[PDB]
C-alpha cells in the first residue's frame, strides 16, 4: 500500500510479484494486485496474474471474482474457455447450476444442450442433489416444450423415495400444467 | 405513385424503407409485399435473396419471421406445381423444428403453436386440397406444437382420422384435447369425438366407451349450458340395459 500510494509503479509491481511468489496461500495480496490491475490498464499482465492465481488452486470466491471480472470486460470466448476447469475442481450443486451461464446472455442452444448432457452424465445419477432437476425444469419452461414433460415425469429414476419434494410437488405440477 | 409501372424503377424505392428502429411485423409484411413486387419483377429473380435475407433476424424470438416464411409458402402455393414448393417449404418448414422462439424480447414463452403449426400445416396435412401428407405428418404437427395446440384441434384430429381412422387417434385426440385447454373448451370437442369415435371405432354398446366417457366428463363444469346426462344417459338407455 505504501508503494502503490506513491508514484512508483515498477517497484510496486516488483513488490507485488515477490509477495505473490513468496506467499501463494495468501489472498489479500492477490486481491490487492487485482485492485491495482483494475486501477491500471487492461493489459495481458492482469490476465496472466489471474491465471497464476487460479493455477495455485484457489477457492470458489476467487473463481467467481475472476468470472465477474471476465464478464465485466466484454469477454465471451475467454469467459467460456476459462470456465471449463472451474467445474472440474469444485463439483458443487451451486457450481453445477452456474455452469450453464451462457443461456442468460445469448440463449446458447447447443451449449445449453451440451451442459444438460454433461449434467445428466455427471455424478448424481441416483439423487442429482435435488437441484439440477428444478433448474432443468426452469430452463425448459423458459424455452419451448421440447423435453419439459420428459425430464419432470419420465426421469424419476434419480429420485429419492418420494419422486418430488414436500413443498415442490404441487408447485412443479402447477408450473408444468400452466406452461 | 406509379405502383404497377412507372419507369420500372421506382418500385425499388417502394421496397426501400430502411430507418432502423424498434418494429415488429412491419418489415416482414412489407418485405413479403416487396416479394410480391419481386413476383411482378420476374418472379424467382431476387425473390430467393429477399426470403433468405429476411429469413434470419436476430435469433428466433419473433412471430414475423415464420409469418414471412409462411407467406413465402403461400406464394409457393400460387406457384402451381408442388414439387419445388414442397421441397423449399419442406426445408424451410423443417428449419423451425430445431429452434422455434423464446430468445429475447417481451414474450415470456416461445409460442410456436401458431406459427410453427401454421408452417407445418402449410407443408403437409392441410385437410382441404393439397396432398402428400405422410402417416407421420400428423405426429409431425403434434410434435410441431410440442406441448399443446388449439388452432387446429378438430381439423387435426380429423386429419389423423383421415390418415388412420383408429382408436389410437381418438385417444391421442382426447389427450391432446384435455391437455390442450382446461374445461370443456377443446374437451367438449373431445367428448363429441369421444362419442362418435366410440361408436365408429370402439364398437357400439361397448363398456369401455361408457367407462371413458363417464371418466373424463365425471365431475365437469356445466359444459355450454349443461349436459351431464343425455349423451351417457341416452347411450346407456339405448344400450339394451333397463337396469343401469
Instruction: Identify whether the C-beta of residue B201 lies closer than 8 Å to the C-beta of residue B170.
Output: yes
Which stretches of chain A sit within 8 Å of chain B by CB?
106-107, 109, 142-146, 148-149, 179
Q: Do A146 and B146 touch (CB under 8 A)?
A: yes
Q: What is d(CA A121, CA B207) in angstroms, rounded to the nearest whole number?
A: 47
Measured on CA atoms in the order A16, A19, A24, A30, is the torsion positive or negative?
A: negative
Distance of CA B242 to the CA centre of its chain: 45
Q: Do B102 and A143 touch (CB under 8 A)?
A: yes
Rounded-to-10 torsion of CA B236, B239, B243, B244:
-30
Of A144, A149, A179, the CB nearest to B100: A144
Q: Each residue of B119-153: b (16+ CB within 10 Å) or e?
A: bbbbbbbbeeeeeebeeebbebbbebbbbbbbebb
Residue B103 and residue A107: Cβ atoms within 8 Å?
A: yes
Task: Determine which of A108, A109, A111, A145 to mutate to test the interface with B (most B C-beta atoms within 10 Å).
Answer: A145
- Burial track A97-127 (b if 16+ CB lie within 10 A, e otherwise): bbbbbbeeeebbbeeeeebbeebeeeebeee
How far apart, in whole angstroms, are the C-alpha atoms of residue B134 and residue A89? 51
Whether B110 sits inside 8 A of A143 (CB atoms) is yes
**Residue A47 lies in domain:** 1-179
Q: How far is B35 from chain A (nearest CA, A)?
A: 30
Residue whose cell numbers read 487460479: A54
Question: Coil, strand, or helix at residue B175?
Answer: helix
Burial A9-47 (b: 16+ CB within 10 A, else e): eeebbeebeebbeeeeeeeebbebbbebbeeeeeeeebb
Quick check: B216 contacting A, CB < 8 Å? no
Contact A43, A55 (CB under 8 A): no
How many other CB atoms are there within 10 angstroms of residue A150's CB atom?
11
Only one residue has cell 418472379, namely B43
Q: How many separate domains does chain A show?
A: 1
Question: In A, which residues are within 8 Å of B101 by CB distance?
Answer: 144
Which approach determined this entry? cryo-EM
Chain B residues touching A142 at Cβ < 8 A: 102
**Does B95 touch chain A if contact means CB atoms closer than 8 Å?**
no
Nearest to B99 among A109, A145, A149 (CB): A109
Question: Resolution in angstroms, to 1 decimal, for this deposition?
Answer: 8.0
What residues of chain B lie within 8 A of the CB of A137, using their CB? none
The reply to whether B100 touches chain A by the CB within 8 Å rule is: yes
d(CA B64, CA B205): 50
Amino acid at each position: 500500500e505504501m508503494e502503490m500510494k506513491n508514484r512508483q509503479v515498477n517497484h510496486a509491481r516488483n513488490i507485488w510479484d515477490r509477495a505473490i511468489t513468496t506467499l501463494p496461500r495468501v489472498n489479500q495480496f492477490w486481491y490487492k494486485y487485482t485492485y491495482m490491475e483494475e486501477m491500471l490498464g487492461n493489459v495481458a499482465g492482469a490476465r496472466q496474474v489471474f491465471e497464476r492465481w487460479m493455477e495455485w488452486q484457489p477457492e470458489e470466491q476467487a473463481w467467481h471474482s475472476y468470472i465477474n471480472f471476465e464478464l465485466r470486460y466484454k469477454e465471451v470466448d475467454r469467459a467460456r474457455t476459462i470456465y471449463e476447469r472451474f467445474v472440474l475442481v469444485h463439483p458443487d450443486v451451486k457450481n453445477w447450476i452456474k455452469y450453464a451461464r451462457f443461456e442468460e446472455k445469448h440463449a446458447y442452444f447447443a451449449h445449453a444442450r451440451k451442459v444438460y448432457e454433461r449434467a445428466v452424465e455427471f455424478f448424481g445419477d441416483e439423487h442429482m442433489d435435488e437441484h439440477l432437476y428444478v433448474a432443468f425444469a426452469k430452463f425448459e419452461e423458459n424455452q419451448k416444450e421440447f423435453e419439459r414433460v420428459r425430464v419432470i415425469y419420465k426421469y424419476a429414476l434419480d429420485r429419492i423415495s418420494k419422486q418430488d419434494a414436500q413443498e415442490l410437488f404441487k408447485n412443479y405440477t402447477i408450473f408444468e400444467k400452466k406452461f | 405513385q406509379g405502383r404497377p409501372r412507372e419507369i420500372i424503377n421506382t418500385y425499388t424505392e417502394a421496397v426501400q424503407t430502411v430507418d432502423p428502429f424498434k418494429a415488429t411485423g412491419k418489415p416482414h409484411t412489407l418485405w413479403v409485399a416487396f416479394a410480391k413486387f419481386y413476383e411482378d419483377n420476374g418472379q424467382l429473380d431476387d425473390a430467393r435473396v429477399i426470403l433468405e435475407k429476411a429469413t434470419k433476424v436476430n435469433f428466433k424470438q419473433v412471430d414475423d419471421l415464420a409469418s414471412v416464411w409462411c407467406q413465402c409458402g403461400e406464394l409457393e402455393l400460387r406457384h402451381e406445381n408442388y414439387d419445388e414448393a414442397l421441397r423449399l417449404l419442406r426445408k424451410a418448414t423443417a428449419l423451425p423444428a430445431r429452434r422455434a422462439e423464446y430468445f429475447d424480447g417481451s414474450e415470456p414463452v416461445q409460442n410456436r403453436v401458431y406459427k410453427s403449426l401454421k408452417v407445418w400445416s402449410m407443408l403437409a396435412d392441410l385437410e382441404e386440397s393439397l396432398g402428400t401428407f405422410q402417416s407421420t405428418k400428423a405426429v409431425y404437427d403434434r410434435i410441431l406444437d410440442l406441448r399443446i395446440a388449439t388452432p387446429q384441434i378438430v381439423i387435426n384430429y380429423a386429419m389423423f382420422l383421415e390418415e388412420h381412422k383408429y382408436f389410437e387417434e381418438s385417444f391421442k385426440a382426447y389427450e391432446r384435447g384435455i391437455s390442450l385447454f382446461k374445461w370443456p373448451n377443446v374437451s367438449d370437442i373431445w367428448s363429441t369425438y369421444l362419442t362418435k369415435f366410440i361408436a365408429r371405432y370402439g364398437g357400439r354398446k361397448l363398456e369401455r366407451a361408457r367407462d371413458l366417457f363417464e371418466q373424463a366428463l365425471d365431475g365437469c363444469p356445466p359444459k355450454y349450458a349443461k349436459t351431464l346426462y343425455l349423451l351417457y344417459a341416452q347411450l346407456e338407455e339405448e344400450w339394451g340395459l333397463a337396469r343401469h
